[PDB]
Each structure stands twice: as C-alpha cells, then as structure tokens.
Symmetry: D3
Subunit: 295 residues, 6 copies
C-alpha cells in the first residue's frame, strides 16, 4: 500500500481514492485493467514493457468501446509520476479504466465516460493441477480483452487448485485442449523445442509470453505455437508458466505426475537468465523494453 | 436516486455510500447482485417475489464461495427498511454483495467478508435482432449465477442491437440454438403452446420466467421447455421476453421479419392480463408472491 | 410427365415451360419447393394436407425473403387447376418458387421477383445404413426451410447408401445424434412408445411426420420427441421413415443389424392403417386433411 | 449481357439459351460453377488463372460425382471462343455444369449427363460487419466445392450486412473463429505479417487467395495460415478480402470499429501494386498466370 | 473368491478358469460384461432383474457384433446353477463375454467365437467431486454398451476423486453438461421433483436407474429425464447415485459445497425405502423383478 | 505361434502363459501394448526403433498410472532374448503390460502390480472408405496412449470398411476433420508437399509416422502437420497410411473416387524406397534406428 494514486488526472492520497457504490464496474464487470512491473535495473528504475502494456489497456477498451480520453503517452507519464511520487523503485503498477457512476443500465448512456486510476505499490516447480472448469469459448466473452469480469473464470480455476493442495490450476478450453493457467500463460518444452497454445485456444496475448518467444528466439530455440492436448503435460520434458506477476514459474508436477526429473528445466533456466539478464545488463535490450522512470 | 442506501447494516446518506478504488469487485468483477420490483397494488406496496429473489442472491454467492453474513430474513427486513426510509411505493431494488477492499490477488485472503448494500430508487412489440455474439458455454462461467462479470456479455449482445436500430438483441448459445435476450428470457407461442429454452441453453433461471410458466399453467396453456432453433423465431405466432425490469415485452419483428402479424399476441395478452391482475387483485395470488412493506 | 404446367399464372404446355440458363436458381440454389400428393379417395380426388404444404412453401420463402405474390389460396386454386386440367386423379404435385432471370449477383436486386411453377404428374423393411456425412449444423443453413440447395446434402447421404447396397442413408447431426434419413424423417419404436428426433437435431418439420404423431395419438400411443443416439437404431424394436413420397417405410435393418424380427412392425402396421384408412373412410379426418380437387 | 452463350458445344444466341423448368439444378441445387476474369493487359486480353479455374470446375464436380464430358482443354478453348465470338476484352466468365432434365429424384438416373454452358459478359476500405450466421460445418456440405447450393449461405451472410448498412458481412465458422466474407476470402496484417484462415475454418480455397499468398512471398512478406479469433479483426493493422470479382478490397472498419486508421493499408498497397502489375508488365508473371485469348 | 466359475457351459474349479495370454480381450478390450446382485429376500436368495441384465448382455454384444451361442435362458440357468453350486445367498454375479485366442488382428477372423464365463462371489452421504476428465462423446465408442474397453474412462474419473480425498467423481460430457459418476447414474432433487441425464448425455441406460424411475413413479414423484448443468449440482436439494453395487448412495457435498444440509435426503429416503422394501416384502414387486435361485 | 513368451521376467513355454479369468484387463480394458518389428537387414536381425517403442510403453502406463517394475533396458534385453530364444529373424514383437488378478474393483487396490508379457512371432493401392464412426474426443480417453481399451474404436471403424468391401476405414474426429485410419496414421500429398493430422486430431503419435516425417525431411520434402478436411482426400495427389505392421501402404481410391490415377504414387514411392533402404543399407541410418538382436 502507498500514498497517492493517480486518479483522473491528479494525484490523490491513498485514502481518498474512493468511488460510489453505484459505479457501473461494481455491478456489471465493466472495467479493463493491466499489470505492469517496474524493476530497479543497472540503470533502472525501469518499467518493463510500458508502451505495450498501455497499448493493451487501450485495446481492451477498444473491444468494449469504453471511451478513453488519455493517450498512451499521457497514461505512461502518469504511471511514471505515480512511481516517482511514491518513491518506489520496484513496484507492481496497476492501471484501471472503469465505467463509473453513470446509471444502472447495462448499456451506459451516450457521451458518458470512464474514470481512470493508476496505483502502484512495492513488489523447483510448483505442481499444478488440471481444473474441471473450462475457459471461455470463442465468440462469447473476448479472451483477448483483459476485462475485469473475465476474472470470475480465473477465480474458479484458481481457487479449485489452491483448495486441493496445488499452487496452480491449468485450464482446458471448451475443446479439451490446453488453454492456460488461471491467470498466466503455459509453455511446454518437448525435445528441446518450445510450444505454447495459440490465442484461439482462449489464451490471452500475454506480454511476458511475448517477451519469452522472443528471447527463445535469440537463444536459438525453435518455438512452435500450436494446440496442445491434455496428455502433453504428462509427456513434456519442461513446463512453465509466465505472467507479469509470476515471470517464469517452473511447474514440476501436474496432477501429481512428475514433469521430468521434478523440475530442473534446462531450457527454462536458459530463458530465465535471458530474462533477468535484461535488468542486469547481461541481456541486450534489442527491442527496447526498459523505460526508466527517472528520465 | 434517493437518499439512504443500506450499507452493511446501517442506512447511509446516498452521497456517502462510497467504496475504495482498490476494491476487488472493480478490478475482478467479483460481486453478485439482484433486481427486485416493488409494486403498488390493491394493497401494495408489495415487493414481488421477494424471497425467491433473496434466496437467489444467496445461490449466486454460494456458487462462487463468497461469504454472506446476513440470513435471508435479515436481507428482506433490510429491503423493506430501505423502501420505507425513502418513502417509496413503486421502486426497483438493487441488492449487491461484493468483495471489498480485500487484497489485490484474484483469490481473496481467507476469512475476508463481503459488503452488502441495498439501494432502491423509484420506478406494439419491439423489434429484436439476432446477435452476432454468443452466450457463455456450459462449464465455463456459471450462467445460473446472476454475477457481476457475466455482464460483459449482456453489454456485447445489447449494444450491438442498439447500434443497428433494434430494441433488443437475442443471443444464441455456442450450439446455435436460442439462449435468451441480452438480459431477459425469451418465450414463443406456436400453435397456442408456450416453449422457452432450458437453462442448458445458457439461459438464466429467471424469476419472472418462472412466474410466467406458473400463471400459464393456471390459464391452462401447455408449456414446453425445449431447445429452440434460430428459425423458430421467424415461424412462431408470438414471441416475447420477460425480466424483473421489463415484465413482459412482446416482440413484433425479429431480424426485420414480422413475427406473425406485427403484434397483438393473444396469448401474450392473456398472460399479460394474469400477471398484472396480481397487483389489481383480479389474479389470485395463490403462491404468495406479494410481500408488503408495512407489515 | 404430362401436359400443362401452371407457370406464373397461366397454364403452359409441358414443352414450353422453359427458363433461361442465367436464372439465379440454376447457379446459386435460390429456389424453394414442396411435395404434395393427391390421392383418389372414397370421395377423392383429394390432395393430402394442402394448406399445410402451401403454408410451408410460404415459410421457406419467408426465411430467405424471396418475395412471393401469390396467396396460399391463389396457390391452392392453381394446384387444383393443374390436376384437373391434366386429368390426373393420383399424382405427385410439385410447386417451385425460384429466383429467375435477375442478375448474377448473389443478393438479387431490389423489387425483383420470383417466378412460380406448379407441375404435376401421375403417381418388409428396406435396410438403411448410417452415413459418413453429417447433416447441416445449426445456425448455418436453415433446416426448417425446404430450400433447393439444401439437397446437396440429401444427395450426399442418399447416393452413399445406394452406392453400397442399401436403400437408405440415415444421417446423424454434427453432434453424433440421429437426425433423419436423406430426405425423410425417422421414427423408432421402443417399448411400444413412439420417439422421433426434434428439429433441433437438424430434422425437417415433415408434414407426414406431423400427421403420424397425431394418428399415433388417436391410436393411444405415447409419443416422445427427443434426441436419439446412434445405438438406438440397434436396440429399437421398430424403425420407420416418413415422407410425402414414401409415406411410411418400414426399415428392417440398419447397418446389417436386424431391427427386431426383420420387419414386422406391429406399431408401424397400426399407424399405416390409420394412414391409408383416411382415403378409405375407415379413418376420420378429425383434423381436415383431405381437400378435394373437384369441389 | 452479350449474344452467344456456349451451350454443350455450340454457340447459341443468348436469348435462346433456355433450360426446361424441371431441370434438376433448379429444384435441388445440383450444379457447379466458376468465376473467371479476362483482363486487358500489356498484351491481354488475358484470362487470369484460367487453368486453375477450370481444374477447379472439375474438382467441384468430382466431389459430387457429376459426370463431365469435356476435358480441361476443351473447356479452355471454349472459354476463349466465347470471349472472341462476343468481341470481348475485359469480361467475367461464368462456366456452369449442372444436372439437366434428368428425372425428379434426388439421385439422378445413372448414365445421365450434365449440361455445360459458358457465358461471358463485360466487366477507402469498406466497412464490414461480423454476421450472425455461420458458415457450414466440416463434414456436412463440402465447402471446398464451389457448388450451387452452397450459395444459400452466401445469401444469408450477404443480405444481412446490406440490410444494416455495411458493404460486406464476415462469417464465423461453427467454432466462433473467422471463416471468410460472404463470398470471398479474408486476410489481416498484424505486425507486417499476413494471416488468413485455413480451409478447415470453412473457407473456400480461393484462386485469388492463392495468388496473393504467392505474390506476398515474392514481396518477402511472411504468411501464416492460421485459425483466427473474431477479436483479431479489431486489433489488426489491416484487413482486406479477395475474390475473382472483387480482386482485393481493403476493409476500413469492422463492426463500426476502425481497423487501424481508416484505410491506407501499406501492405495492402504493396500487394495491390504487385497484383495489378501483372497486367501492366511491372510484375513478372513467373507462374504463368495470364493466358491470351488470341493465340 | 469361491470355487466354480461357470465357463463355456461347464463348471470349473476356480483355479482352472484360465485363459491364454494372447486372447483378444486382454489386448484390445473386446469383452462385454454385466453386474448382477443376488439378494437374500423375504423369500430370496433372489436375483435382481436377472433377465434384464442378460438381455443387456446380449445387447452389448449385438452392437459390437460379438457372436453368442447362448440363449438368455441358458445364461439365466447358468447364473442360478453358479449361485446354488457355490452355496451362496448374497453375492455379486459377474457374467463376461470375451473374444478368446483368436489372432492378434483387431478384426477377429470370420466365424469365430466368444468365450463365456459367469463368476459369482459373496457380496450419511458421500462427498463427490466434479472430475477434470469427460465422458465418451457421441458417436465414438457406443455408451449404451457395457463393453470393457470403456472402463478406462471410469478408471480415470474415479481415481481422480479418490486421489483428492473424495469418494466419487462425477463426470461431465463433452458438451459440459453432467453425465454420471465414474461407475453410476446420477439423480438430483429439486422441488420434490426427480431429474436425471438422458443417455445422450453419455449415460449408460442403468438397470438400477430404471428401477428407481419406476419406483418413484409408484411413490407418485414426477420425473424429468433432461439435460443437466454442472451448477445444478450445487443448487439441488438432494443428489444421489445408483448402480448395481451401490444401490442408492446419497451425496452430501459436491466439490465441498453442501447439498442442502449435509444430508438429510427426504426424497432420497423415500426411494431407498421403497427400494429395499422389495426384498423385505413391504414393496409390492408389481413388475416381477425378483428371480429365486431355487426354482 | 512360437514357444517361449517372456513373462514377468521368465521365459515360459507358449502354452503355459496363462492368466486367470478375473484379471483386471479382461474385464476393464486396462492393458497397455506396443507393436514392434524385427527386420532381417543388411546386418539385421535388427529391431526397428526399439527403444522408442519401449519408452512409449512406459508413457502409455505413466498416463494411466499403471506401475512398472522394469526399466527400459530390461524390457529391451528381454525383447532381444525372446527373439534369439525363438530363433527368429523376422517377426512382430508384442509387449503387453496389464493389470492382473487384483480385485473386481475398477481402481486396483493400492501398491498393486502389473503383469508383463513379450510375445514375438514370425512376420497397387488399397481403396479406403470414410467411416461412419468417429474417434475419441479430446479430453475423454487419452489418445496419445496405446491402451487396449481404445481398440474398440479401431474395431468399429475397421470392420465397417471390411464389411463394405473396402480394406481400410479412415476416421474423422468429432470436429469432422480427418483423424487417421482404423489402426494407422494418414499422410496426403499435394503439390509435392507432405501433410498429416496433428495429435489433437486424435491421432496416435505413431512411431512409423515419425520415421516417415524424418525421412521426407532428408529427401528434402516439406512437411505440414496441419488439420485436414474430409474432402481433401478426394483432391490430393497421393494418400498413404503408415503403421508398424503396414509400413507404408498406398491408397488409391477413397470412397470409390480415385486418388489421382489409380495409384502411381511418386512421393509415396520415394518414401517407401528411403524407408526400406534402411534395411538394405542404401539409406544411411543417421538416427540410429536399428538395434541388432545379437549384441
Ligand atoms: C493478465 C493475464 C495473463 C498474463 O499476461 P502478462 O500480460 O504476460 O502479464 C495471462 N492470462 C490471463 C488470464 C491474464 O488476464
Ligand atoms: C436477471 C437476468 C434475467 C432475468 O431475471 P428475472 O429474475 O426474471 O428478473 C435474464 N437474463 C439474464 C442474463 C439476467 O441476468
Ligand atoms: C421434404 C423433406 C422431408 C419430408 O417432408 P414431408 O414434408 O413429410 O413430405 C423430410 N426431410 C427432408 C430433408 C425433406 O426436405
Ligand atoms: C468463389 C468463392 C470465393 C473466392 O474465389 P476466388 O477463386 O478467389 O475467386 C470465396 N468464398 C466463396 C464462398 C466463394 O465461392
Ligand atoms: C455399469 C454402469 C452403470 C450402472 O448400471 P446398473 O445396471 O444400473 O448397475 C452406470 N454407469 C456406468 C459407466 C456403468 O457402466
Ligand atoms: C498403433 C497405432 C498406430 C500406429 O503406430 P505406430 O508406432 O507407428 O505403429 C496408429 N494409429 C492407432 C489408433 C494406433 O493405435
């Protein structure tokens, strides 16, 4: 927790960042959000993949049509201010754009607007389990949009797992194929080859997942994106999840069945290092993923 | 609007019913809610199917394991208190149980509690359109729960129709069979028979829908809950929707194709007469659907 | 073959009933048609279920929106004229409403019209087989509409069967459940109970199928409409198909597996008799299904 | 229009190319057909991908076992004869093989033959809409065949869009993934990459689509045939359709949501320049796509 | 154990009923079996719905075309002889029909034969879990047949449950609706109304399930065979399984959610009573369901 | 036949490898097996991709959790010993792993054990038919495992074919795309390009299929593992199956439609040659696929 939360343009003390109980988002799910990290690097404070997280913010809203007045540049400025103002060096940043107090109609009224908030606060395998709950089918609720009411599904998958002793629930899609974990993407390593499910497998265009396939590429790793069947979890040699909060989580077991040697992940280790190496200097920011706060 | 919103037990001045910005339900759509109508009748104010609505508030949370402190009777008294203290007669009541300012993780920290809030405020066919979006598939995000997050889907089906000049969009399930309108059930009359999709067609078990089947049975109309094909909409003699806020709306054209002779639903008529005769005294409340405020 | 074919209002000799090679129907499938019988009865010439066949004609067009100028009464008059003029007593009548010479655009041009034709000409089990071709999925091509391009599917199912020695191909739907034969409905008799698939099983609202469930009812037979699984063909006690051309066809084998005693059909026999009994006088036209030509 | 339609070998005065009204293709949609463009080029008249189109005429009939007397070269000569005898330069050619006046049963009487007829006549983005109808499912009515009956589906997807003010409706397959427009393929550009659904998404293997992939490869653009989710349409940088009659049409908005900056597709541009440069001589015909009439 | 297993028509000491290791069934899962109970009654030893279990043995083989020398009556007498011969009063009878030492080719040689055995040996709620595995889809492996290859599904659903602490795994079909538990049918109770999945939900046509439906009809309960959703499990008042070896087991928590008051089962109890009273003499065996070994 | 079947670590005269009739596997289909070939080579007796077949034996059991005492190497040596001991040069080796005389309960008691056997005995196109049965759906019965319960599917597809005159039945998945034939993988050839269904099409990860992909890559052919449609079968230039006992069989007509010229198979032939040349010495065994019995 901290002080100050950027909110509709201005910095507000943590405690006065309040909203009415009749805001649309609280009843209908109508908000859209992001997860961004800020690492202290060899040059950092640096936020990892800023522009790309804010452009996703804008895209989630585009799908739903929540009018948004800030620009990606305005929004990135803001996020840097929140960090700086709060005197944070390594934090989890959280932008949210939600339909505020507007009526109680599902279809908000014309020329209405969203209120936008940006808060920040300081920041072997694990045994996953396959869940009985499937992820969202296709043309039903946009899995590409990172919208707030999507997380009901992440709640179902996640709790079920925790409730039984695991640390993660991997969900299948309505087709019976692997989609992803409760709230983060799933990678398998077979014979030294990469492999993740495509988005049509109701997976979400993770930005970490993205950085990974790229590093995998610099690292000389073939990467195949394709539909994975349940069984593959039992036959893979490595399995690991990715996400802004998690980064790279080795999964050493799935349904109790050991995933090769009980976590060791030679490929995983290589990728991990490529990853952290970025904040250390060992890895070249070929692409331009670090955006210092203190510029 | 009104003044006074029952919030966790106390009545609060409406302008003061605020919630912090980091409340779980805003970000992750975790909240559950209901819609209840208060009608003025031949004796009313009379809350319609008050108990069924409150039980359903409880079923919906049971399904997501959200912890509710209040019993069903506490909730009912509080709804009646809310009506009175605002000096209301005919209103719309909105009870909302939601995960509050528990932390920022999807699985709320065990032993947390919800916040309940009850708010009340005063309160031919129509040309529907079949929508391009589909309702949630079966074992993904439970459609039998009136939950927050589900609403992204009523928004998608709902704006689309408005956007093209219709007054309601009817959604299909992932199998291509009729589900229900954006936020309300759908019925059709064929050779004087009733017909409405099963919950298995991704239809919410509606409290109004339930009332209509009962009345129908008393009016001696045969009723068939059965899966329906998109084309029946164009071949039916009558079609109409029902919901707590829309009672029974007849539909005169679907996709521009006139549902049998541009409205005058004889059966829709009789059912509209039975339903309203409840509040008039013409229809004998045999199930005990009306619950006065001042008792 | 005969002389005279009603065509757009007038009677034309069989040989001059011609149309341009660039009529829309020949290239795009855009026609809609019916099959009606005319039996010589104890009072007949009588056409069986006239109005209901012409109303279906009108409904197929309604789904597709092929403007039609004739009325059901105009069209029935016509059909009686064609019969009478041709001096037919027992015939197969064939109305067709197709998009004529209009352009080569799939979406015919505004205020265009259809040309309508009405021609007539004189009019154990069988071993069916289950086909590898599935029937049309749901919201793809209206199985309720009896449109001309639908018959590609009937061609696939039918030829496959004939090509292998059977007399009929029963098709499953995309779900793996029984839908119907190539061009006629499928009934199973289990323990003295009826059973046919509903339309949502991509079956077509056969008018014979309709008369059957009715007679079944007068006859004291319970009738259940529901989703049948493949296996049921092997476990049923009776199986039989229906259609305007076929009437009631006992199926004594399916995939070589005998369907109870190699056709005997006690229930089938009862229904059959109820059916023919109609033209004989033995059965009462409770419903009003005979429409004499010579009135 | 023109005068002279090649009909079963002879050239006939256009007004005389008539077919009896009881021809099979009118009632049962049994006919197969193609669309070929004749362009005037830096040497043209030049029939574009003439052989591929005629081979496809043959593939489509092979699939339904319609017997074709003419070889591929007979058909080509006849198409060139048709162009010449009508003194055409730039035209649209329509070859149609169809079941003629064989009897009235769905399975045409063995040893029957088709009738072929070849006719020729002279010849920002656009705002598409995602349709409420779905394209044919996999093993129902073969979508790899350009057949008559399939067209009921292009009509349904096509009028709907027109009916609501769009210039094209994009259809989804029964799985909720993008199939293709009403009668033409769909492509998207993302980070400068190409992407187009597989035939398995119920997409017809288009001859123009094929040309575009080839040119694209020569322009050095990466191409990915992969299943696509409805939402990619709103997130893509460019989107455009292709068909023999519509070449390459860019799409500027889908569902009212602007596809990246309301048209100017850089890549669509380059591909439009390569494709047209064929007829100009700027693009070297390496595959041999142009086939002169006068040779 | 016991001694004397019937075997191809002869009784054989238990230790001599051996079969070669290259018997079809051990490699390819080509056996078909039954589960039958002998009950000590108010007149028993009495075999429960003996013939119906033998008819189904026949049906299971008829579908896979396995040949059967023995009539139902011979199988029945042999069943009795095995009971008497072993001096049993209450046991679990197990008849198998399997493909023997025939070749290593999946299609047994023509005119082969199945070996037959008949072994018989002496014979609050539970807490089910919804399984992460699904049951056979429709036209894949006939589910109306108790083939032994099937039990790989039961093996996976049941061990998942056991491994996690539960005592029964309930499985969903491919559609996501409820099917049945690992080895038994599933009934739900709502407002004193019955409810169970039909076969098309990939439910074996249980013989107990049927007994129960028949009883309930006598008790005057209404029954609804209708498709069911996962969530209905957490909202019913009572849920219970049935099968030859579990008779009528009550479930009291599903996924750790109480089925309306940690068991109390009112309708469940009326049923069990009526069930067991058939053995006691209290329930009239109106149907003829009890066959005494000693006749 | 032969004499000496390995068995739980001992060699046993062929007639003494017997197993009790109440062994799990005969009732419940709980065995797991492999198909291996011993080839007389330019240096053989040589076992083809021996270890990979033994690893897969392990994998099949790992998925069903069947316990295994023997290492891969012990299974390998035992394989060799059975070859030598029987004085064989070319045979078909069959290793089984099955659940023995454990109880009649679907879940074997804890700490139980699987019995292991290893029998070995001496060891134009075809005309396939598309089957009316489909293959296991995705998360129902793991298809990446060669369990024996599975072969009920192979049993149904293959006998359908044989019964109708064909010699192989090709099966579709539940989606309607192509899966594989009764017992072997299916490859198609188009414009000198390879093509086969991925596993998610419910295709067993064949060991021949893999060999073939590897060869073709050496021959410089391009390969595409991609989902395939039924109709692609009638349009490819060459189609062929593969499996341990069929090596590489060419199909020349599918459903009675010639696969481009009643076999001539150019790419098919380059493959077979490269295949067989591994045994002759012509093809370099770059991978190490041949294990000599005598080491
Ligand atoms: C947020 C999210 C992820 C993680 O995405 P990153 O953008 O890589 O931080 C993965 N799956 C779901 C469901 C998510 O919403
Ligand atoms: C609330 C709701 C209905 C209608 O409910 P009633 O209880 O009849 O008020 C229908 N569909 C959806 C999605 C709903 O939320
Ligand atoms: C025409 C038709 C039938 C038969 O209908 P009747 O109207 O009973 O004559 C059945 N199935 C299909 C596919 C048909 O088009
Ligand atoms: C003909 C057609 C196309 C486009 O074909 P081209 O060969 O590129 O002309 C696309 N979709 C459908 C349904 C078509 O018929
Ligand atoms: C054996 C079986 C049952 C129970 O059937 P009963 O005749 O009633 O004992 C139920 N489900 C499955 C999968 C079974 O095979
Ligand atoms: C055994 C099997 C194959 C063939 O596998 P190979 O290792 O290549 O012999 C293919 N399909 C099925 C269903 C099989 O089980």
């Amino acid at each position: 927790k901290a002080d100050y939360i950027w909110f509709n343009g201005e910095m507000v003390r943590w405690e006065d960042a309040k909203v009415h109980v009749m805001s649309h988002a609280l009843h209908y799910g109508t908000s859209v959000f992001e997860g961004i990290r800020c690492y202290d690097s060899h040059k950092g404070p640096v936020v990892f993949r800023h522009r790309e997280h804010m452009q996703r913010l804008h895209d989630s809203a585009k799908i739903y049509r929540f009018p948004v007045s800030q620009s990606i540049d305005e929004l990135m400025e803001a996020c840097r201010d929140v960090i700086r103002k709060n005197n944070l060096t390594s934090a989890y940043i959280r932008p949210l754009i939600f339909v505020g107090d507007v009526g109680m109609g599902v279809n908000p009224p014309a020329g209405y607007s969203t209120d936008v908030i940006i808060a920040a606060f300081p920041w072997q395998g694990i045994d996953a389990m396959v869940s009985s709950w499937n992820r969202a089918a296709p043309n039903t609720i946009p899995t590409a949009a990172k919208a707030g009411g999507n997380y009901l599904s992440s709640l179902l998958v996640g709790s079920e797992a925790r409730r039984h002793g695991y640390q993660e629930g991997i969900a299948l899609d309505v087709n019976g194929y692997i989609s992803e974990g409760a709230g983060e993407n799933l990678f398998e390593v077979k014979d030294g080859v990469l492999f993740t499910p495509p988005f049509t497998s109701s997976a979400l265009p993770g930005i970490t997942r993205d950085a990974i396939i790229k590093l995998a590429k610099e690292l000389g790793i073939e990467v195949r994106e394709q539909v994975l069947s349940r069984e593959s979890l039992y036959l893979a040699d490595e399995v690991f999840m990715s996400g802004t909060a998690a980064e790279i989580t080795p999964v050493r077991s799935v349904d109790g069945i050991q995933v090769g040697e009980g976590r060791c992940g030679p490929v995983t280790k290589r990728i991990q290092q490529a990853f952290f190496g970025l904040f250390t200097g060992e890895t070249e920011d070929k692409w331009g993923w670090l955006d210092q706060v203190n510029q």
